[PDB]
Design a protein around this ligand. Structure first.
Ligand SMILES: Nc1ncnc2c1ncn2[C@@H]1O[C@H](COP(=O)(O)OP(=O)(O)OP(O)(O)=S)[C@@H](O)[C@H]1O
Ligand SMILES: Nc1ncnc2c1ncn2[C@@H]1O[C@H](COP(=O)(O)OP(=O)(O)OP(O)(O)=S)[C@@H](O)[C@H]1O
Ligand SMILES: [Mg+2]
Ligand SMILES: [Mg+2]
Ligand SMILES: [Mg+2]
Ligand SMILES: [Mg+2]
Lengths: 359, 352, 358, 351
DNA sequence: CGAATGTGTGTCTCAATCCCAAC
DNA sequence: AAAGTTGGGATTGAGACACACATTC
């Protein structure tokens, strides 16, 4: 997983009547007013990857005056160059998916299925791994247990084994169909060998499907992943200068913090300390799979709920981060402009958003 | 027959640990640097960036720096400065803090020549260029090259990182630097001094300990500024004396035994000022060390209590299943290759 | 809701091992670093008003080293001075509630029962009106329709009429039995006097319908909407935002009028959402500027707002005269400079310390 | 022997989140300095609110600094008192005025000046909040005791006096001791009137800060005071008001077709390209877009096209005795005897 | 101590909505 | 041919309810 964004164009997308925005590698800072148009850019990225949903109304995302919507997106993943073009004219919609120039998919549902095949992440877990929205930096840690490990698998690159679990269900059940194709069916008896031969083989196939399961090897690999993530989590957490012994991470990825005369959980912490643990944990996971899932990461206003000091120290954290190839951060704060590699300024003339990028 | 002062990386306004004392230590060390500079009476002061720590520093830091460079300008000392990375304005209409020093300091973004005791010396410099606009920086340097050949004495002021000194975040290489008699550089807080291209390349270290990775350099080579004697036609290390200022002492201790506890107390007592302790200490040793929270400034010490490709096969074989099949099948399914063409081979050939 | 807080004392409550904090009438600003004990104070007040729930765990609110918790709270409402006292010793809990020196309640459930009637607000609706937590500034906007108008009824002081409508059910029924005393017997001249009482009891029910939901409550709310819309525009325009005007439906759902279309709070940015929520709460306050002089508590409202919107918000708070005492928590300096009393809260060894500046 | 009374510059105020409105303050301030230098007054009294914030932008600090350096270089003594936006709120941080320490005397006490052979008494203090008035009075009474010897005396305060600003006043009128002149601030209404055998004066703001102050600018120009204290006493005659040029504002309440004609002739008959605000009917906006270049910005709205009394009103509208509804409404909410009150109504006044 | 409580949680449902493809 | 019409699909909100956790008599 070598995923990096390149550039995106958009027409009549909410406040953006027409905007072309190129991305670069490193610390990318999106700055602007409230309602200037910062988040709309990533609403557009999400629109290009996955089509509009029922909650993602077209009336929600078309420019309230206009009637059409056009968005094309250029990105790279595992070394290949891809380009998506989604449009909606006056009632009809369309989607195109190009790979290194030539087209791969031409219908909307075809593009959707294909995008879900290249990223390995659906609608639900792309907002918990790569595009973290407002406040949800720490939501993943206080989440419901099953949901918590469900997303932990995705940001760890473990979901690649769940895909093998279900696609393995395909094979087990289809080979069983190959048993039913035989069951209904001075020459005789060379099929008694096939009963044991295929039945024991299907028991073997299910016995392998349990290896790829959650509680099988996913939980095991997660166990072997915890210690490293704990050490990195404390290394990055101590940069917040907080008054705690050390940060303990359970096998189930629920966090316990060691105070001198007690032990606290995320339930007790303050919001800003939650955000601290969250960013330090995502950076620990990123530092763990330095080559397995060298993925880009997008943050929408993370320094919110952080004081002046924690904002500064967090910036000095982001400067030392070398595991994430491209991190795009949106902020209304000046504590991150000074540390960024590329500053994308987004102003708004009345109700239309205009972008001035400084290289 | 002249002398000048090379100083950099003062980081006025740096509030380490959000602590008032550590904020005042930077102001004090800077004031004392100004004091020693006033004691020396140098002809020119070359400040090569990072005077302030932020683009919007506190009013107190602005007052301190202002009164310092006013002291320098009223004494007929010309001060040249180049903007640092912490001083380059990020937005458009807002101004850099160095604009408050316009009447006492020449902010260098080009060339200038000075007559000192009967000899023309060429000074040139530019602001901090981010790694993106290096070619622009190069286009400035070659320009500063063409305007320099007439002068046998020349100095270059830059606030960048050169490759052979910082591998982490360097913005220029060594071969991009044209030949100059002296290189007054900044942005790295390890004090560096070495020969370079028939000249002297120098990084004036920081004035106070800013980032904690810089005490490793403080005890070897003290922090302060450089005093350079450009009397001879050329420059050597002999006529460069480094003037060290006194900083806040830091004491590192690893008290997990009682043999490592005398190392603490005997050093905390045998140091100049109220030190800063950090590291790890066993919780059964911490409370009997807390007795010295009066002879220390602050205590930043920890209280301590008391790839997959191999593991998948190891796991599958440990469960009793051909891990070669589990792995080759895992790769067969992740791609869009025929799982049937791969499994039928196993069921026919290598099955039991 | 003529609500005002006076002072609070707390022992072993979360990070505050011991702290007495004095409140003042005006813009009381609580400042500190992250996790320095700012929100913990309001968690303490909420503990004083309403006992510990399952959501309000003792192990959660006990100081992790200690084993007991004590908190008393002085406040005034409608002219009366009250003192709430709650403690948990070693497994058993107790509570005392004094009214002007002498005690009023002596058990925990008795204290809760008294609080809910003196305030006219319960535990859950107290979080949507007086004590607004972090990020939950817009929670009052996005509430369920029934829940939205339900909390709006309390916010406008209409809810008290319901207290009559239910008590009328006690009254009407009673006057019905005095009629049953004639009706349950008139089977198995002065006959006109029999009809007098019947017509009277019939009068009582229509009077009950006056106090009912669809009767005068909805009528007064419908007459209240334009005023809150006017004030809402007055405060929202202070954010120099590019929108025609802010329409407020009678169902208290907000619509923002753009030049080439109409947007809703869903489409607005987080910051614009906060702009609308705050300016609407202040529109409700300014609507009943003298009718319901309620106090307001906010925990980081300037979050998601840029530099300019934070500043403008400060000036808005300074011009607000409708709320007698508003207590705001912030990590931002934009509100230090506008407050009258500034309460600085720092932390030493996991223990918070309070320094009051008048 | 003449001095200038100026206050409330609010440097750094960025109205409407707009760059031009931030610059206009700098221009009006620079122009005030320009006129002051053109006059060459003996003393400049700045009575507070020079900056808008405690941590103003670097540009505003440079502008103010170079301005007061110019004033000090021309042998003009400037006295200032800290305003409400300039009193440090936290511990270690400094007021912005500390950057001007070597060109301006920050007044927190007394000082005497010799002007062509005459002792003039100047005194002043910073902004005292309404809580610490008792300390302020002790500062004022001291300034009284040290003043009885001097026939010429002036008091610099950055407060609000009761009979002039009723909203947020921090001092009353009778607490002010006798002085020949009162150099005050914190209210942007330009005020000048006699007070205790002297002249009390609010120099007012320099640029339109809050929107309630263009109505003043058309009536009362904004700027500073030039006072002639040459004679032994002071009157209104020897005080000349100096007006500065500000940003024009155009107010329109377009709900009719005649309210579009008022626009162009007013927008052109003003000094600089103005700022329009108010209400414009939706049907008029597209035909209003033709002159959006001869305007700065248009903060105008697009427009499309007591319970105790109202309860009785409602009850009578439904056909029910309102006074009964109200008296009962009080009887049960105050938990009074509704039995004793209901039993009477059925007897006397029913049908 | 066990029952009465509200408080939250997980999960399940019918129902609506709106995108998306097809005739 | 063209235009709406129409069912497949996905998610979401409100409404139910057993299962816990913890306070409190
Ligand atoms: N359909 C639409 N037509 C026109 N404008 C729209 C539409 N939908 C939304 N908007 C406006 O577009 C603007 C975009 O703001 P956002 O998308 O939130 O970006 P942002 O405010 O810069 O980032 P954040 O994270 O939300 S603060 C807002 O002011 C919306 O009111
Ligand atoms: N039982 C406990 N014992 C000791 N400390 C605790 C306990 N529960 C929580 N804390 C601490 O109390 C602090 C929480 O105080 P808060 O008031 O929430 O912080 P804050 O300053 O208000 O920041 P905000 O406003 O909540 S973002 C954190 O530092 C917790 O670690
Ligand atoms: Mg540097
Ligand atoms: Mg540096
Ligand atoms: Mg003022
Ligand atoms: Mg003012």
């Amino acid at each position: 997983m070598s995923m990096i964004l390149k550039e995106i164009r958009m027409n009549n997308f909410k406040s953006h009547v027409n905007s072309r925005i190129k991305f670069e590698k490193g610390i990318v800072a999106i700055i602007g007013e409230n309602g200037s148009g910062k988040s709309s850019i990533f609403e557009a990225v999400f629109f290009a990857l996955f089509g509009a949903g029922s909650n993602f109304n077209y009336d929600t995302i078309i420019t309230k005056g206009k009637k059409s919507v056009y968005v094309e997106l250029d990105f790279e993943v595992n070394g290949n160059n891809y380009k998506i073009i989604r449009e909606y004219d006056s009632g009809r919609g369309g989607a195109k998916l190009y790979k290194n120039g030539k087209p791969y998919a031409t219908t909307i549902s075809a593009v959707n299925k294909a995008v879900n095949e290249i990223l390995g992440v659906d609608r639900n877990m792309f907002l918990n791994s790569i595009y973290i929205k407002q406040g949800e930096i720490a939501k993943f840690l206080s989440l419901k247990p099953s949901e918590k490990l469900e997303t932990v698998a995705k940001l760890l690159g473990i979901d690649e084994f769940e895909k093998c679990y279900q696609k393995m269900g395909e094979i087990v059940k289809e080979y069983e169909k190959r048993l039913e194709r035989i069951e209904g069916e001075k020459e005789m008896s060379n099929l008694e060998k096939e009963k044991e031969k295929l039945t024991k083989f299907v028991e073997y196939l299910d016995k392998v499907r349990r290896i790829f399961g959650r509680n099988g090897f996913q939980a095991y690999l997660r166990e072997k992943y915890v210690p490293l993530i704990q050490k990195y989590l404390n290394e990055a957490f101590s940069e917040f200068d907080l008054p705690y012994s050390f940060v303990e991470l359970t096998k189930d990825f629920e966090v316990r913090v060691h105070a001198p005369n007690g032990v606290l959980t995320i339930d007790n912490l303050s919001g800003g300390e939650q955000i601290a643990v969250a960013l330090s944990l995502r950076l620990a996971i990123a530092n763990a799979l330095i080559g397995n899932r060298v993925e880009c990461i997008i943050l929408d206003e993370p320094t919110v709920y952080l004081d002046e000091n924690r904002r500064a120290k967090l910036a000095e954290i982001f400067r030392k981060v070398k595991s994430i190839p491209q991190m795009i951060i949106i902020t209304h704060h000046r504590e991150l402009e000074d540390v960024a590699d590329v500053i994308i300024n987004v102003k708004k003339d009345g109700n239309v958003s205009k972008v001035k990028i400084n290289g | 027959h002249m002398m000048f002062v090379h100083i950099a990386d003062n980081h006025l306004g740096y509030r380490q640990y959000n602590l008032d004392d550590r904020e005042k230590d930077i102001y004090d060390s800077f004031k004392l640097c100004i004091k020693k500079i006033l004691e020396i009476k140098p002809d020119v002061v070359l400040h090569s960036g990072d005077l302030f720590n932020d683009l919007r520093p506190p009013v107190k830091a602005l007052r301190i720096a202002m009164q310092a460079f006013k002291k320098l300008h009223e004494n007929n000392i010309k001060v040249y400065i180049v903007a640092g990375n912490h001083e380059m304005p990020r937005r458009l209409g807002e101004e850099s803090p160095l604009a408050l020093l316009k009447d006492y300091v020449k902010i260098l973004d080009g060339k200038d020549v000075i007559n000192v005791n009967g000899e023309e010396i060429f000074i040139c410099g530019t602001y901090y260029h981010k790694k993106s606009k290096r070619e622009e920086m190069l286009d400035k340097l070659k320009n500063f090259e063409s305007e320099a050949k007439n002068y046998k004495k020349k100095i270059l002021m830059l606030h960048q990182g050169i490759n052979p000194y910082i591998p982490l975040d360097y913005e220029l290489e060594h071969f991009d630097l044209p030949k100059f008699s002296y290189y007054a550089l900044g942005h790295i807080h390890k004090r560096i001094l070495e020969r370079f291209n028939d000249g002297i390349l120098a990084y004036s270290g920081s004035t106070e300990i800013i980032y904690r990775n810089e005490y490793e350099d403080y005890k070897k080579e003290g922090k302060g500024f450089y005093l350079v004697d450009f009397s001879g036609n050329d420059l050597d290390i002999s006529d460069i004396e480094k003037i060290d200022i006194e900083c806040r002492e830091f004491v590192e201790v690893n008290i997990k035994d009682k043999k490592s506890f005398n190392e603490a107390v005997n050093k905390i007592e045998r140091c100049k000022n109220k030190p800063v302790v950090f590291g790890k200490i066993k919780r059964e040793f911490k409370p009997w060390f807390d007795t010295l929270k009066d002879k220390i400034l602050i205590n930043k010490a920890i209280i301590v209590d008391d790839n997959i490709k191999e593991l998948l096969v190891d796991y599958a074989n440990r469960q009793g299943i051909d891990g070669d099949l589990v792995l080759s099948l895992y790769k067969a399914l992740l791609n869009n290759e025929n799982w049937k063409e791969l499994l039928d081979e196993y069921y026919n050939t290598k099955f039991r």
